Design an enzyme around this catalytic site. Sequence first.
Site, mmCIF file in Angstrom:
data_model
loop_
_atom_site.group_PDB
_atom_site.id
_atom_site.type_symbol
_atom_site.label_atom_id
_atom_site.label_comp_id
_atom_site.label_asym_id
_atom_site.label_seq_id
_atom_site.Cartn_x
_atom_site.Cartn_y
_atom_site.Cartn_z
ATOM 1 N N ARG A 214 7.226 8.849 -7.005
ATOM 2 C CA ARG A 214 8.417 8.038 -6.820
ATOM 3 C C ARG A 214 8.103 6.802 -5.993
ATOM 4 O O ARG A 214 8.573 5.703 -6.308
ATOM 5 C CB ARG A 214 9.522 8.873 -6.183
ATOM 6 C CG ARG A 214 9.892 10.152 -6.976
ATOM 7 C CD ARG A 214 11.269 10.697 -6.530
ATOM 8 N NE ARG A 214 11.616 10.264 -5.166
ATOM 9 C CZ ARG A 214 12.659 9.493 -4.843
ATOM 10 N NH1 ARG A 214 13.488 9.065 -5.787
ATOM 11 N NH2 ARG A 214 12.877 9.153 -3.573
ATOM 12 N N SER B 203 -3.276 7.526 3.614
ATOM 13 C CA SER B 203 -1.846 7.774 3.514
ATOM 14 C C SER B 203 -1.505 9.001 2.674
ATOM 15 O O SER B 203 -0.319 9.239 2.413
ATOM 16 C CB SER B 203 -1.125 6.532 2.972
ATOM 17 O OG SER B 203 -1.599 6.160 1.688
ATOM 18 N N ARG C 101 13.162 7.379 -13.785
ATOM 19 C CA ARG C 101 12.759 6.057 -13.357
ATOM 20 C C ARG C 101 11.417 5.766 -14.012
ATOM 21 O O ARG C 101 10.556 6.642 -14.075
ATOM 22 C CB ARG C 101 12.688 5.985 -11.825
ATOM 23 C CG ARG C 101 14.026 6.306 -11.141
ATOM 24 C CD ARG C 101 14.254 5.464 -9.885
ATOM 25 N NE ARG C 101 13.738 6.113 -8.679
ATOM 26 C CZ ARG C 101 12.509 5.945 -8.200
ATOM 27 N NH1 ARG C 101 11.648 5.147 -8.825
ATOM 28 N NH2 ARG C 101 12.131 6.584 -7.098
ATOM 29 N N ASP D 152 -0.509 6.908 9.681
ATOM 30 C CA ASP D 152 -1.460 7.588 8.807
ATOM 31 C C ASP D 152 -2.702 7.894 9.638
ATOM 32 O O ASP D 152 -2.646 7.898 10.870
ATOM 33 C CB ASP D 152 -1.702 6.778 7.514
ATOM 34 C CG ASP D 152 -2.572 5.547 7.714
ATOM 35 O OD1 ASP D 152 -2.960 5.238 8.853
ATOM 36 O OD2 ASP D 152 -2.880 4.897 6.693
ATOM 37 N N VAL E 207 0.847 -1.187 0.000
ATOM 38 C CA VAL E 207 0.000 0.000 0.000
ATOM 39 C C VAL E 207 0.885 1.240 0.000
ATOM 40 O O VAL E 207 1.824 1.339 0.792
ATOM 41 C CB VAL E 207 -0.959 0.007 1.197
ATOM 42 C CG1 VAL E 207 -2.093 0.979 0.926
ATOM 43 C CG2 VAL E 207 -1.497 -1.385 1.433
ATOM 44 N N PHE F 222 -7.114 -3.141 11.039
ATOM 45 C CA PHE F 222 -7.245 -3.267 12.491
ATOM 46 C C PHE F 222 -7.001 -1.960 13.219
ATOM 47 O O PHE F 222 -7.524 -1.767 14.321
ATOM 48 C CB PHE F 222 -6.307 -4.350 13.026
ATOM 49 C CG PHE F 222 -4.846 -3.991 13.012
ATOM 50 C CD1 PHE F 222 -4.154 -3.818 14.206
ATOM 51 C CD2 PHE F 222 -4.145 -3.909 11.828
ATOM 52 C CE1 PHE F 222 -2.816 -3.528 14.211
ATOM 53 C CE2 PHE F 222 -2.792 -3.608 11.815
ATOM 54 C CZ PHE F 222 -2.133 -3.423 13.005
ATOM 55 N N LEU F 223 -6.225 -1.051 12.633
ATOM 56 C CA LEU F 223 -6.027 0.234 13.283
ATOM 57 C C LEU F 223 -7.286 1.101 13.169
ATOM 58 O O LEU F 223 -7.788 1.614 14.175
ATOM 59 C CB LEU F 223 -4.784 0.900 12.707
ATOM 60 C CG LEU F 223 -3.564 0.078 13.142
ATOM 61 C CD1 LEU F 223 -2.570 -0.195 12.016
ATOM 62 C CD2 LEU F 223 -2.871 0.731 14.305
ATOM 63 N N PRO G 14 4.674 -2.037 4.090
ATOM 64 C CA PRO G 14 4.784 -0.585 3.914
ATOM 65 C C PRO G 14 5.842 -0.159 2.918
ATOM 66 O O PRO G 14 5.975 1.050 2.683
ATOM 67 C CB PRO G 14 5.180 -0.117 5.316
ATOM 68 C CG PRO G 14 6.100 -1.202 5.767
ATOM 69 C CD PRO G 14 5.527 -2.493 5.209
ATOM 70 N N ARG H 171 -7.280 2.586 -3.829
ATOM 71 C CA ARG H 171 -8.175 2.760 -2.686
ATOM 72 C C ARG H 171 -8.818 4.136 -2.795
ATOM 73 O O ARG H 171 -8.142 5.168 -2.662
ATOM 74 C CB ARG H 171 -7.492 2.571 -1.332
ATOM 75 C CG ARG H 171 -8.532 2.607 -0.194
ATOM 76 C CD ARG H 171 -8.038 2.113 1.168
ATOM 77 N NE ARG H 171 -6.865 2.854 1.602
ATOM 78 C CZ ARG H 171 -6.211 2.653 2.742
ATOM 79 N NH1 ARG H 171 -6.615 1.737 3.602
ATOM 80 N NH2 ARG H 171 -5.142 3.379 3.026
HETATM 81 C C1 LIG Z 1 -2.674 2.244 9.596
HETATM 82 C C2 LIG Z 1 -1.742 2.325 8.368
HETATM 83 C C3 LIG Z 1 -0.265 2.660 8.602
HETATM 84 C C4 LIG Z 1 0.639 2.740 7.512
HETATM 85 C C5 LIG Z 1 0.145 2.516 6.099
HETATM 86 C C6 LIG Z 1 -1.258 2.218 5.908
HETATM 87 BR BR1 LIG Z 1 -1.806 1.932 4.180
HETATM 88 C C7 LIG Z 1 -2.225 2.102 7.025
HETATM 89 C C8 LIG Z 1 -3.701 1.802 6.768
HETATM 90 O O1 LIG Z 1 -4.549 2.953 6.206
HETATM 91 C C9 LIG Z 1 -4.082 0.813 6.972
HETATM 92 C C10 LIG Z 1 -5.637 0.579 7.241
HETATM 93 O O2 LIG Z 1 -6.587 1.138 6.305
HETATM 94 C C11 LIG Z 1 -6.118 0.363 8.534
HETATM 95 O O3 LIG Z 1 -7.325 0.823 8.773
HETATM 96 O O4 LIG Z 1 -5.196 -0.338 9.431
HETATM 97 MG MG LIG Z 2 -8.080 2.101 7.361
#
Ligand SMILES: Cc1cccc(Br)c1C(=O)C[C@H](O)C(=O)O
Ligand SMILES: [Mg+2]
Length: 711
Positions: A122, A272, A301, A617, A115, A444-445, A527, A328
């Site tokens: 870049r 993000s 690139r 994020d 993601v 999960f976040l 990541p 997304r």
């Molecule tokens: C939480 C997070 C950190 C770094 C990169 C991304 Br991509 C994300 C997500 O937005 C993940 C997600 O949608 C979630 O709800 O955990």
């Molecule tokens: Mg999310």
Amino acid sequence: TDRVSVGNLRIARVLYDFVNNEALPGTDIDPDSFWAGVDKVVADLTPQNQALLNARDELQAQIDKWHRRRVPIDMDAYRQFLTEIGYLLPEPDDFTITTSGVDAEITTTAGPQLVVPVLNARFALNAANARWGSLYDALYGTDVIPETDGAEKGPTYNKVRGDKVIAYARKFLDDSVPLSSGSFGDATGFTVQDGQLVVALPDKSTGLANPGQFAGYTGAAESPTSVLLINHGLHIEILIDPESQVGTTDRAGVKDVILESAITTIMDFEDSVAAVDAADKVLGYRNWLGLNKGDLAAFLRVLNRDRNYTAPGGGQFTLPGRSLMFVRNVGHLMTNDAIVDTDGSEVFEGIMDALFTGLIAIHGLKASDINSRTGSIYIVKPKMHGPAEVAFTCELFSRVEDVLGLPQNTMKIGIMDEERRTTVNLKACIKAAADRVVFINTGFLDRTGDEIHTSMEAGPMVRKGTMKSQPWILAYEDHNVDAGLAAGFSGRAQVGKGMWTMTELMADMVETKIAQPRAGASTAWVPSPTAATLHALHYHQVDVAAVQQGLAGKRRATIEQLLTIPLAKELAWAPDEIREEVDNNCQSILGYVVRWVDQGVGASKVPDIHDVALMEDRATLRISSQLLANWLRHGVITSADVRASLERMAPLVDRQNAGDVAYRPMAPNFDDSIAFLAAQELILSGAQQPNGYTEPILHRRRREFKARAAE
Ligand SMILES: Cc1cccc(Br)c1C(=O)C[C@H](O)C(=O)O
Ligand SMILES: [Mg+2]
């Protein structure tokens, strides 16, 4: 801001010129038919979109009041309460998804999913090209090989370290594509002979324990320039060049082990990236168009071409050189003024993304220097609450398809399972999208943010670190796989799990993240391109297809365990514990917002209180801010506590941005910083943000900064 009139809409010019001159050419869609469809779809579907948002608001207020009453925690009445108010809905009869026309990278291949912020060309380039990746480079440049004595990364090449790297790959080769007898460590060369690969040991010669795993080669078969292997559907390439610097000191001349890594990539318009006006959205859209046309380029690139090999029998074939791309979209919540109507009302940004990212994706199905070889467009739809919000996304895609001229169900949807009302109705959500759904994933976040906000009234929550082991999240991750496999996701759609945020702890990742494929997940989120190459190791050890088969029919989470609220225990913490949790949250909050507001960066590496680098994020900010807002609602800390901590960590943040020129500090003039005041507002107003979402305040403060920078 100058606008263009199309029916009841006033499209900002930069977006109008961009769709017209850049995105519409080559799709045989007529600009007037397009914009007329935008107007018609927006007028038709904006009502129901706003009804759905009010339903959230209304459901959340009944739960609010329900907790406030209540003096205990009877789970049978809570259940019966949420059912009665329509939060918890009946479970449909079992079914099986019909989603046709999906790519092999999604139905069949299990492996990492990357993601990336679409507004960073870049990074978006590197993610597309992250289908293939150097295992040596990922082992050498990260802490997978510890930096013990002798083996530490230098300014030049460390041979002690490089030898460990080689030894690590040789054990992977042994653990993945084993020889009949002997080790790849002891190899001295490779040949294909009679359509069969033959490894030269010191005393004898051996072939693959499973010759099927031999996939092809390049160069003259007598001494191939590389040997291509497969295992668990994922490709391994041994590059053989004995006169390369690394290859000269190698017993079989090996130059590198190349791993098929990022199988799919999600180009991200949501958490993000920071994008608050038509100017911002166009930067992302334009990058999205360059990816779909094959010509995005940074230097210089560019995107990689497919990969030619030689079959073991002797023929030729070719392999996807780029990562299959999702996009997304943003979800149902926000509006953007890239388009406003005659009353001046801002238009729902979710609807705008389906029209514009959809339109642009048509280039991806077309010969310019190609994305979905089967005809589909892959849209991740985040932050949905329940089955009716899934159906609304369905209806939206249906209406965007015919405005765009695309057969119905072309735009497939990857469903995020990241909101509690979706969790506890997941099967009905999947049913609502049965002929579009292309994955499910446990965000999960975000799911922890919604968990905290939903029960914001019930009492003070457990610390952030404790959520990873709370009962509700353990049942949530299992319940997600069960509903996926029960809906026939094996061989049809991805069962995906969440993000690894510790971008510098690749030892821990390689050791920990294996739990996800072991959990039956056929994809999970990484990541960076490097983390993708490392996460690929996990799918060579775990046979995810076999794992899914052994989970079939299992029902492993109760509705009662899903609804287990992560409340803390009476007097569960000491002063320094609370002080530490507060400080840590304020530092992660501040260090992310300051670059959000001051510079428009929607994802940043921010070290926590333990100086562990965490890619942040909006979701992790959703968690830090809603946790502090909850300890505030229930008395654990005061507003002077929060004010103090904010002023404590803020100068430390400014310092950490020691790496970054043209940057505005927050300290000492706290009330003169739009970033500080936004950080503060996210906390002090956190309880009143709908479902705890951070976009309203972030968007409003980012435009505030942009407008103050106009003088
Ligand atoms: C939480 C997070 C950190 C770094 C990169 C991304 Br991509 C994300 C997500 O937005 C993940 C997600 O949608 C979630 O709800 O955990
Ligand atoms: Mg999310």
